[PDB]
Structures are given as structure tokens and as C-alpha cells.
Design an enzyme around this catalytic site. Sequence first.
Site, PDB file in Angstrom:
ATOM      1  N   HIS A 113       0.775  -1.230   0.000  1.00  0.00           N
ATOM      2  CA  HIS A 113       0.000   0.000   0.000  1.00  0.00           C
ATOM      3  C   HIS A 113       0.809   1.285   0.000  1.00  0.00           C
ATOM      4  O   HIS A 113       0.224   2.356  -0.207  1.00  0.00           O
ATOM      5  CB  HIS A 113      -1.078   0.033   1.109  1.00  0.00           C
ATOM      6  N   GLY A 154       2.499   5.816  10.422  1.00  0.00           N
ATOM      7  CA  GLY A 154       3.895   5.609  10.071  1.00  0.00           C
ATOM      8  C   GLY A 154       4.455   4.270  10.529  1.00  0.00           C
ATOM      9  O   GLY A 154       5.567   3.943  10.127  1.00  0.00           O
ATOM     10  N   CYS A 170       3.351   1.225   9.755  1.00  0.00           N
ATOM     11  CA  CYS A 170       3.233   0.144   8.813  1.00  0.00           C
ATOM     12  C   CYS A 170       4.596  -0.296   8.281  1.00  0.00           C
ATOM     13  O   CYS A 170       5.513   0.524   8.073  1.00  0.00           O
ATOM     14  CB  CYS A 170       2.302   0.533   7.653  1.00  0.00           C
TER      15      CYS A 170
HETATM   16  C1  LIG Z   1      -0.194   2.145   7.904  1.00  0.00           C
HETATM   17  O1  LIG Z   1      -0.683   2.156   6.546  1.00  0.00           O
HETATM   18  C2  LIG Z   1       0.793   3.306   8.002  1.00  0.00           C
HETATM   19  O2  LIG Z   1       1.422   3.519   9.048  1.00  0.00           O
HETATM   20  N1  LIG Z   1       1.005   4.044   6.889  1.00  0.00           N
HETATM   21  C3  LIG Z   1       1.897   5.185   6.796  1.00  0.00           C
HETATM   22  C4  LIG Z   1       1.213   6.486   7.216  1.00  0.00           C
HETATM   23  C5  LIG Z   1       2.008   7.644   7.224  1.00  0.00           C
HETATM   24  C6  LIG Z   1       1.447   8.875   7.614  1.00  0.00           C
HETATM   25  C7  LIG Z   1       0.098   8.947   7.940  1.00  0.00           C
HETATM   26  C8  LIG Z   1      -0.694   7.805   7.962  1.00  0.00           C
HETATM   27  C9  LIG Z   1      -0.133   6.570   7.593  1.00  0.00           C
HETATM   28  C10 LIG Z   1      -1.425   2.385   8.834  1.00  0.00           C
HETATM   29  C11 LIG Z   1      -1.152   2.047  10.291  1.00  0.00           C
HETATM   30  C12 LIG Z   1      -2.283   2.495  11.194  1.00  0.00           C
HETATM   31  C13 LIG Z   1      -2.402   4.010  11.366  1.00  0.00           C
HETATM   32  C14 LIG Z   1      -2.785   4.218  12.812  1.00  0.00           C
HETATM   33  N2  LIG Z   1      -2.363   2.981  13.460  1.00  0.00           N
HETATM   34  C15 LIG Z   1      -2.094   2.016  12.589  1.00  0.00           C
HETATM   35  O3  LIG Z   1      -1.752   0.907  12.943  1.00  0.00           O
HETATM   36  N3  LIG Z   1      -2.485   1.560   8.260  1.00  0.00           N
HETATM   37  C16 LIG Z   1      -3.623   2.010   7.698  1.00  0.00           C
HETATM   38  O4  LIG Z   1      -3.978   3.189   7.731  1.00  0.00           O
HETATM   39  C17 LIG Z   1      -4.481   0.986   7.034  1.00  0.00           C
HETATM   40  C18 LIG Z   1      -4.255   1.095   5.526  1.00  0.00           C
HETATM   41  C19 LIG Z   1      -3.243   0.144   4.941  1.00  0.00           C
HETATM   42  C20 LIG Z   1      -3.968  -1.158   4.750  1.00  0.00           C
HETATM   43  C21 LIG Z   1      -5.460  -0.836   4.776  1.00  0.00           C
HETATM   44  C22 LIG Z   1      -5.565   0.664   4.920  1.00  0.00           C
HETATM   45  C23 LIG Z   1      -6.626   1.126   5.879  1.00  0.00           C
HETATM   46  N4  LIG Z   1      -5.941   1.152   7.178  1.00  0.00           N
HETATM   47  C24 LIG Z   1      -6.482   1.251   8.353  1.00  0.00           C
HETATM   48  O5  LIG Z   1      -5.791   1.096   9.384  1.00  0.00           O
HETATM   49  C25 LIG Z   1      -7.897   1.617   8.558  1.00  0.00           C
HETATM   50  C26 LIG Z   1      -8.866   2.141   7.679  1.00  0.00           C
HETATM   51  C27 LIG Z   1      -9.990   2.370   8.449  1.00  0.00           C
HETATM   52  C28 LIG Z   1     -11.332   2.907   8.138  1.00  0.00           C
HETATM   53  O6  LIG Z   1     -11.513   3.266   6.828  1.00  0.00           O
HETATM   54  C29 LIG Z   1     -12.696   4.002   6.362  1.00  0.00           C
HETATM   55  C30 LIG Z   1     -12.215   2.970   9.197  1.00  0.00           C
HETATM   56  C31 LIG Z   1     -11.894   2.568  10.490  1.00  0.00           C
HETATM   57  C32 LIG Z   1     -10.634   2.044  10.806  1.00  0.00           C
HETATM   58  C33 LIG Z   1      -9.706   1.932   9.802  1.00  0.00           C
HETATM   59  N5  LIG Z   1      -8.436   1.510   9.783  1.00  0.00           N
END
Ligand SMILES: *[C@](O)(C(=O)NCc1ccccc1)[C@H](C[C@@H]1CCNC1=O)NC(=O)[C@@H]1[C@H]2CCC[C@H]2CN1C(=O)c1cc2c(OC)cccc2[nH]1
Lengths: 305, 303
Positions: free
Chosen positions: B41, B143, B145
Site C-alpha cells: 500500500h 507511520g 506500517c
Molecule cells: C499504515 O498504513 C501506516 O502507518 N502508513 C503510513 C502512514 C504515514 C502517515 C500517515 C498515515 C499513515 C497504517 C497504520 C495504522 C495508522 C494508525 N495505526 C495504525 O496501525 N495503516 C492504515 O492506515 C491501514 C491502511 C493500509 C492497509 C489498509 C488501509 C486502511 N488502514 C487502516 O488502518 C484503517 C482504515 C480504516 C477505516 O476506513 C474508512 C475505518 C476505520 C478504521 C480503519 N483503519
Amino acid sequence: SGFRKMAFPSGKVEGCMVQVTCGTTTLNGLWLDDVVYCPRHVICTSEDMLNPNYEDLLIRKSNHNFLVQAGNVQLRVIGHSMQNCVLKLKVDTANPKTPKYKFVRIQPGQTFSVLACYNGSPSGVYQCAMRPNFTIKGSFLNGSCGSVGFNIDYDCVSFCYMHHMELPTGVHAGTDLEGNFYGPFVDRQTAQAAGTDTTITVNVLAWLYAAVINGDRWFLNRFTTTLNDFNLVAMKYNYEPLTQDHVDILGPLSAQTGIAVLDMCASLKELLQNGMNGRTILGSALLEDEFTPFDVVRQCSGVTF
Amino acid sequence: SGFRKMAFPSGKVEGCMVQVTCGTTTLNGLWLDDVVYCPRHVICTSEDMLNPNYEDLLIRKSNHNFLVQAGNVQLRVIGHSMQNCVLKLKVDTANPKTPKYKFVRIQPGQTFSVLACYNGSPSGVYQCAMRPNFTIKGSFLNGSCGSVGFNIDYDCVSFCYMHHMELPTGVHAGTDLEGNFYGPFVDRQTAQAAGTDTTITVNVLAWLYAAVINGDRWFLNRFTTTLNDFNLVAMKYNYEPLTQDHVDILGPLSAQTGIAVLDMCASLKELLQNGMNGRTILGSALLEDEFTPFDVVRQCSGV
Ligand SMILES: *[C@](O)(C(=O)NCc1ccccc1)[C@H](C[C@@H]1CCNC1=O)NC(=O)[C@@H]1[C@H]2CCC[C@H]2CN1C(=O)c1cc2c(OC)cccc2[nH]1
Ligand SMILES: *[C@](O)(C(=O)NCc1ccccc1)[C@H](C[C@@H]1CCNC1=O)NC(=O)[C@@H]1[C@H]2CCC[C@H]2CN1C(=O)c1cc2c(OC)cccc2[nH]1
């Protein structure tokens, strides 16, 4: 999100662990620049530990009686001295993995990471708080002496603990890296009791701020208190009094939430006086006292090293 | 003596962490030999993430669209491929700090250490269990991930987890190092629920043995149970079934303490039926299920 007891990454400390043997006794040492630091009881037999005279025991040792090893690789000892309860062994090789470092003496309530080691080989890492009675609730087996505790800030490892002893109650005692014990303990094979422990108020207040940051704020009351009146009531419940330094380290959490430190004190006072009444805070019926204000901030914000 | 949740020393993994940027997204990668592994991603825009056709999005990228940084050194990407939810970036430099390693897929109930990282820099290390519903109860921020989970045996790092997502409930989800999710989760921008979580019974039993070894017996009783009768009550309380293999794995702890496995099951039955009545076990007001029998043995052998 999520709240976990978290250790510092241990790599910078792993690269400093060695073993020190005198006779058949092997324990861990800390190799920084061209010096190895370890517990002075490495010079004792099991029988010597009942009533050791360290100065007299060390006079009988020369540089050539110390085996220092990084794994199987021997580092030649070229000097020795005793500083309080730690032995300093000058070696002929400067550790190329030496990080930026400091030696610090911590206060009760401060947390640190322990790198548990056996025969100079790191086995695990965990987080501890120094209790008000100057013990830690660690996990240490035979061979663990000389394992260290530390914090990291940016690139600098602050070493604060070296392991020496397990008390009869199964809690642990040790020294700073200058060899001064935390608490009233001595490096002799005698039964030694710690003082009655108390709850670390500043850390409980940090955890209540953490709860508020996460939207869990039912316990916030409409009162305030003076610091003195709070300290007097806190002591009745076996809580530590607050110092000015505690008030200051809660400052960033107070600013973040808009809840004055003394207002949070008044909230905690009501929790102590009335109890939880079947309610929880951050999913728990117990007030947590081993997260510092820094532990709350650094984990809520994701600081790296 | 003493019993603490304990992670593996993280140094062998710290030496493999790098930062990967593609467009506006920066996250972590794992650099082993001349390959960097990271979540796929990283290639996606916010709009792409609603329904990302990853093969179609990745074919549109060139090697130079990936910026890999190891400390203050850029590593040139010379090839790329995708394996499920993991992107593999071939780089022109071998990681000199590559440990002996394996990629493994862990089983529910097993534990591992997480090295939480941000911008390719290690932040902290903690222990997690793979839950029966294939979530983990981590601590991960924006950040994080590409942070990995692992176990260490002698000098060999077994990588089992790469971090991808935080669910609405605040638990976490991710993949193995072949890019296959643990659980029914998908790498798209949607709110996703897990299956009903259950408690890891064999681990609770192991932790009760840890408590006994550390001098606490308050919760023991004079009774026994059969395996099946225990399992009936366990299932009523949303605990996983205890198998004969679990009974066998608990053998060393049973031998150490002199408490038969089914006698400890009778103790656990009583705890479930009566509660803890304001008391604690190893400092906890709840029954802890994230310590395996191996985790207990490692800290309690010879006490
Ligand atoms: C991860 O992608 C990440 O760290 N990415 C880099 C980044 C850099 C700056 C700003 C944001 C992200 C991230 C890790 C999360 C963020 C908070 N805590 C974590 O563990 N993952 C995601 O954001 C993840 C992405 C990647 C794979 C699927 C996509 C969705 N997602 C979610 O965690 C997610 C999406 C939702 C949602 O969507 C409408 C509703 C509710 C919860 C949710 N979680
Ligand atoms: C530490 O010396 C160590 O690890 N030494 C290496 C080693 C190698 C093989 C076999 C044994 C030891 C050790 C760490 C302990 C051991 C179990 N858990 C630990 O944390 N420290 C001691 O054993 C320590 C020594 C060193 C300074 C005082 C001396 C006694 N001691 C105790 O822990 C100790 C002594 C008593 C006691 O004395 C009669 C009564 C009750 C408890 C107690 N603890």
C-alpha cells in the site's frame, strides 16, 4: 493507538554486553570504550559472599585473574579498580559499538528497560519502574548479575541500573553504574528486607492524563487542592507525596489536556476517598503506577532513537 | 525469580529497518540481503485505497518511484515484484547486518516480539500474541506500517508479522512475510470487524503455573476435572478448547510444580465461575492469556 509497556530498542546495549569470570564465577559486564563495568562480587566464591571483605579480596587479585569475553573472544585486562560496588576493568580494546552514553542515577517512579543477559548473551528486554522502596519487580535468574537497565534519548543511552541481588520476597536490587546501591542494600549473602512499598503518585496521575487524552474522563471532578494538602491525604492511602519535579514533569500532559495538575490531584483524591464504585479507567479497575509522564507522551507520539 | 512480559532483544532486527517512500506515502521496510520488504500500500493514493487494484497500480510504477533510505544513505532500487500484500524492492547494496533468518507463519496463541518503527527508525519493542481471531493488541501509530514481528532462536530471526492496519476497535492486523493476512482482513480503506475473540486457554494455564512458581497459590483448590468437563465450561466463558497436545506441552510446568494439568484446569474453572474477588495474580486483576508455556518455562525453569 494502543497502550503497552514498551521497552527501548536494545541493540545499542546488546553491543556492549560481555562476560566477566574470576575463578568459576561468571557474570555480565558492560563494555564502553576501553572499560568493562561489572558487579564487584565477581571476585567472591560462594563461601566468601557470607562475609566478604572486598578490599582484602581484591588485593589478592591481579589483572591476569580476570577473564573478559565478548562471546568466545578474550579481551585482555590491563587495569582494575573498584568504585563502590562495581569493578572497572580496563581492557586493551576500545569497543567499536560504544554508543553515545551517560551514567545516571534515577529516582523512584522512573522507568527503564532491562536487558536480561546470561554469560554475556542478551536473552530478553522488559520495562521496570524503580519502586519507592528502591526495589524493582524484575525477572532475573542465576547468571543475570551485571545485566543493565537504561533509557534512550535521541542517540544517547543513559545507563541507570546494574543488577546485583534478589531479595527473599522475589523482588530485585542493584546499583547505579557508579556502584552505589539503590536503597539500603549490601552485596553480602544475608537476608535483607526492603521498606514497605507505596504507590507512585506521579505515574498514577500520568495514567489519568492518558485516560483523559483517550476520552475516558468520568473521574474529573469540580475541585482543586493545594499540593501540601494533597500530599498529606495521599500518604494516608500509602501513596507517595509529590515533589516539585513531579509537578513539572506532568506539565506537558496538563497543557495538552487543559487539566491543571492540582485539579487532577483533587480528582485522584476523590478516587482514593470514594473508590471506583464499579467503574473502570482505560479498561482497568486498578490504577496503574508504572507508566511515567514521559512514557505516556513518547508512546502516544511515537518518538524514535 | 519474577515474571515479566519480555521481548526478544531487538538489535538483529534494528539493523534491517529502512524507510520506503513512494509518492506522498512513507512507511518502514525490512532490508535482508539485497531485498527490501514492505507493505504494498506504499504505492497507493488515498483515492486508490477505497478499491486498489494492486497489480494495475504497481505496473504503472518504475524503480525510480521508490525512495529507500537506510539511515542517511539512499539505496537504489533496481527491481521490484509483489507477493500478495508485500512489495519486494531489489536494491543495489547487500545489507551487511543481515542476520540468519527465516519467514514463518505463526499459529493463533503463539507470541512474538514487535519492533515498532517510524521513518525506518526503531521506537520500541513489545511482546504480542496472535489472538484466536487473528488480531494483535499492539501499540502502533501513523507511520508504523512495515514494522515487523519476530522470534529469535539461538542466532536465527524468524520473522512472522508485518504491520498493516488498525481496526475500529483499536486492535491491529497484518500479514506474514509472504504477504498473506492473518485473519479475514483486506488492505483497503474500510472499517473492518474481526471475528469474536476468544481467550487462549493453554496460555492462561501457563500463566497460573508462573504464578505458583513465583510463590502464589491462593487460587488453587483440592478438586480435579476431566478434560471434557473443563472444555464445556471453557467454551461457556468464550475460552478456546484445551487439547491433549496442550496438556502435553504443559507437562514440564506440571512436573516442576507438582500440580497436574487437570488440577490446574479445576483451579481455572473456579476462577471463571467465582471471579477473583478483588484479588490479583502476578499483579493483574484479570486472567492473562498472552504468555505461552515456552514463555513461562524460559523465565521460570530452575526457580
Ligand atoms: C499504515 O498504513 C501506516 O502507518 N502508513 C503510513 C502512514 C504515514 C502517515 C500517515 C498515515 C499513515 C497504517 C497504520 C495504522 C495508522 C494508525 N495505526 C495504525 O496501525 N495503516 C492504515 O492506515 C491501514 C491502511 C493500509 C492497509 C489498509 C488501509 C486502511 N488502514 C487502516 O488502518 C484503517 C482504515 C480504516 C477505516 O476506513 C474508512 C475505518 C476505520 C478504521 C480503519 N483503519
Ligand atoms: C548474581 O550474583 C548472579 O547472577 N551471579 C552469577 C551466578 C551464576 C550461577 C549461579 C548463581 C549465581 C545473583 C542474581 C540472583 C540469582 C537468582 N536471581 C537473582 O537475581 N545475585 C545473588 O545471588 C546475590 C549475591 C550477590 C550480592 C549478594 C549475594 C546474595 N545474593 C542474593 O540474591 C541473595 C542472598 C539471599 C539470602 O542470603 C542468606 C537470603 C534470601 C535471599 C537472598 N538473595
